[PDB]
Symmetry: C4
């Protein structure tokens, strides 16, 4: 069940592909929970909370190196203690980013997923590989004498900080919150974004055709003006370069009614219904997270 | 049952008017649901995937042609050739939809009553096609309203793509849920909110003596602004009794922005909590009607 | 009525006092529910749709104060078709207001009500009487050579405009929807308004005490600046001349977190769960309101 | 049951730490409930109404003296003499609360764990008293930080009236509901959203090259402003890769405004739909302890 050198119940159930029907109810078994929870309070938490500190320090050094970037590259090293700190910090952030890149490649070679929607499945590792990729593509451009390295560095800085949530596991309520938001993005945000993108683009495509000329005669500008409504900034007077105010006002009011007053509230209702439906489901998938984490550190050491 | 050439239960349950108590639920029996989901997996799903592709390309061509309209119509180079070809193809799609709507009306020959309670999609497409034709005739009639009817036709046409979201279980249910919310909750909210909006706008306009919003339209727009989190609360100072103005503005906000606006969320939540089952059944019926529509086309 | 007149069954159960334990399931009695349903459409509904039209036309005859209001009253007659319309509309509105005043007084005398649960229950007629009182004091202000008549009549117009929601009843969905807005303003909007007022008064008092001098040194100005956060307009830097920024920023963030991020969402959740609990009782109370409304038409026709 | 001067079941329930498995449901029994309600109605209730009146009067006196403070402290007129006596009466109230907190801390002999897990109300009062005392010290110590201390104390004093909402069934349930929501939902949301906001602020500031939005504080405030529905999306233009700037803003907005806040509104709704009995039982415990405390006071 725990150690066999060939195959173990914990290994097959924790590492089981999603195709298994009850992979979330195959771990509540009395001995399996007592063993996994033991392993959680035995080693895996000691390796999960020491590694958490290491990653936090890595992200604090990576944000120190990025913020203090000097203003084409590469650059020289000024004789200053601050410059030395910056140079060691960026060298250490790049090293960590190539370490994550190797960990991801090892994960791909070893587990060998079936090229079947592996983006929703084990999405934590694919995100960590995207961050390592953002760091190593920020390294080659920087040595290639181009300023797109900063665009890449801000994206790697914005990918690491948001992915910090990976360590929310090990804490019951905080893990249940993380898994609940994750599946909510995979469900409520995806559908709402599809329909909202259709309405926003179409209503913004009808305005830009109606508008004659000006700062807002571009499709991008009109889309931005139309989007400003969702964030409580709708102006309703941003342009007067049109022959027909009735046609503009009718279109803008229709867009507001269709999106702001109907879709957002209907989304808040759907999020309430979904939240009321999945307490047990979110506990069982959270139980699958910590359980895999237990075996992951049990194999790391 | 499915091919009898006299009367098919599939057609009887599908083309039944809203009168029938159990037009949605009766289709879930072992034979009807399994026969329709099969028809979807046989010669409807892929016939509906190509049709949607064609309608997406048509909508892209119509947007590209309209987005570049030159500035009293009617109005050589590769760009102008492409623009005129796109305009012609857009007109050709509009007229095709117009004949399709006419054919639907003549065949189904509605009872004069279900055209407003059933198949909102057909009515929505016919109105889009009518806007398109009004935009053609006005364009050839030496008038600039051709661009007003055109932008409305494009705004309605872009919104009509939700008709094709059926064929997908989650997105179809999503569309049916939007349809029901708009029909019930948005209608009630709009009635009660409009009564409030009008009453307090007429009250504020009356308070103002001589200013920039004396016009009822400007003040109505100002009071509507508060609903989208862009309210001013100090838009005017050219009046007397500042206490009366501020009290009137604080009364309105609470009754709508802080009471009826949040009331729309609770009712939406209640409804969504109650209409999952019927929303799935209606999607199934829309899918079954599309299946029998794809079969009768031949 | 179940065969009795002096104290008819449907008369007493409809005109029951507040202290009655279960008045809500009285008119729903199948027989008593078919007394105000077979009679509902008999005549009272025809006299309730005519009265609704008569009140709408009355309201609109006075809602055009934009067109009427001249720029030290009383005023002169301009000898035109517009001024004639204005004066006849004013007279008609003043007469209808007197009519609603005399109706309210005649209700207070005939019913000799408790006038303590008359503001929580049967509060509709209280609002109508308030509308009639504001009209009366508007006429006296206009005749007493004062400019406060414009404020009184503008409050009366808004008071009578909100009251149209009374005649919104008679339709099952709309009346029960107004019943939910009626019971949600009594309980939830009261409790939230009481806790938000204490919070907003306290933080405004702290902010104005911190502010050293400026156009916002007034308590009223700072209170308004603090309130503007609720409607999605918070500036977070409205003042400049105040105590060291160290204290002004922390106070504003605390106010935002406590009021915008916490109490409005708490109000939404509370009105969601309440809406989930109040279907049958909202239908029954709507039935009680129609039973009394049509009983009033039965006694007045 | 009432008092044996060594141990009574009433004091046993009221003074036991939160460690007890079911300290909230013990008062639900008939005898304890009826006896505690009767005691309340008899005297404790009238004793709690006068006590709140005194606090309301006190807060106003201190507030009035603080609002009209003269503008190098420290510092013959009816206003000045009123302002100096109000300050004296405010300093006298702060001292009284200080001594009450010390007495409650020395009597309960807290085990240093439930001190910051329970009696949150007792803790809030001692903190507002400490700021008042440090305000007096600074005032007489020739410093201008007494204003900062006084405004903090004034804010806490105005927000602490929620301690006198107990004694009222609806205002007591609402106040415990707000307590539990702040204890769990607000804290978890704040943790996650602070992580997000720090990440995206550090990404945006690292994208800018120079300007008055180059500092972390201003750019962090700018990113925070989106949550209150007053976002800009065009706050700065002194940088490169406008695509990178707009993508980073649109990702932050999608993550926080349209996903995190609604997520919080759903979780809140769940908890409210779940806590009714616990909130009622905790308010009853706040009321029973109050009756027991009034009996102990004299
Ligand atoms: C007059 C038009 C009023 C449109 C308001 C309602 C919008 C809406 O509910 O859906 C509309 C429709 C989906 O109903 P359907 O026809 O399929 O359902 C019916 C019927 O109800 C039942 O279910 C079955 O018999 C079977 O399903 C079918 O018989 O088609 C869409 O989904 C696109 C609608 C997209 C939203 C736009 C609606 C309003 C038009 C926007 C105008 C823009 C102006 C610029
Ligand atoms: C540390 C400072 C922060 C404290 C946490 C916030 C506390 C809060 O919010 O609950 C209101 C609180 C009531 O706690 P209680 O004592 O009743 O807790 C109970 C009680 O002790 C009893 O044992 C059992 O019920 C149970 O075991 C126990 O849990 O205190 C009030 O009575 C309202 C006061 C409301 C003020 C609190 C909000 C903070 C204001 C910030 C002002 C900033 C100014 C700048
Ligand atoms: C490449 C995207 C744009 C880059 C610039 C902006 C930064 C956007 C960051 C998007 C990723 C954040 C969303 C996300 O997916 O977070 C996951 C975290 O919960 C980690 O928890 P877990 O381990 O996966 O359980
Ligand atoms: C004097 C204060 C400002 C006066 C301005 C008048 C407009 C401000 C709002 C007045 C009160 C709003 C509440 C209200 O008027 O609702 C009543 C409706 O439910 C009527 O329906 P119903 O009879 O109760 O069923
Ligand atoms: Na806003
Ligand atoms: Na807003």
């Amino acid at each position: 069940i725990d150690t066999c050198e060939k195959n173990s119940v914990l290994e097959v159930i924790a590492y089981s592909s999603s195709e298994t029907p009850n992979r979330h109810d195959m771990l509540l078994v009395e001995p399996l929970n007592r063993l996994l929870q033991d392993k959680w309070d035995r080693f895996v938490k000691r390796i999960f909370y020491f590694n958490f500190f290491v990653y936090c320090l890595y992200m604090i050094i990576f944000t120190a190196a990025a913020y203090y970037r000097p203003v084409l590259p590469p650059y020289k090293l000024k004789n200053t203690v601050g410059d030395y700190f910056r140079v060691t910090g960026e060298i250490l952030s790049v090293s960590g980013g190539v370490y994550f890149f190797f960990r991801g490649i090892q994960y791909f070679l070893q587990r060998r997923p079936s090229l079947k929607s592996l983006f929703v499945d084990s999405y934590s590792e694919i995100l960590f590989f995207v961050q390592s990729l953002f760091m190593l593509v920020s390294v080659v451009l920087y040595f290639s004498q181009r300023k797109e390295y900063v665009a890449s560095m801000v994206f790697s800085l914005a990918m690491g900080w948001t992915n910090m949530l990976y360590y929310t596991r090990g804490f019951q309520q905080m893990g249940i919150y993380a898994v609940m938001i994750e599946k909510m993005i995979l469900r409520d945000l995806c559908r709402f974004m599809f329909v909202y993108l259709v309405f926003l683009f179409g209503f913004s495509t009808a305005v830009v055709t109606l508008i004659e000329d000006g700062k807002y005669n571009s499709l991008y500008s009109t889309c931005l003006e139309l989007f400003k409504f969702t964030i409580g900034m709708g102006d309703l007077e941003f342009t007067e370069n049109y022959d027909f105010k009735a046609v503009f006002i009718i279109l803008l009011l229709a867009y507001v009614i269709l999106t702001y007053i109907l879709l957002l509230n209907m989304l808040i209702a759907l999020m309430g219904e979904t939240v009321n439906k999945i307490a047990q489901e979110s506990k069982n998938i959270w139980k699958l997270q910590r359980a895999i984490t237990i075996l992951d550190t049990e194999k790391s050491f």
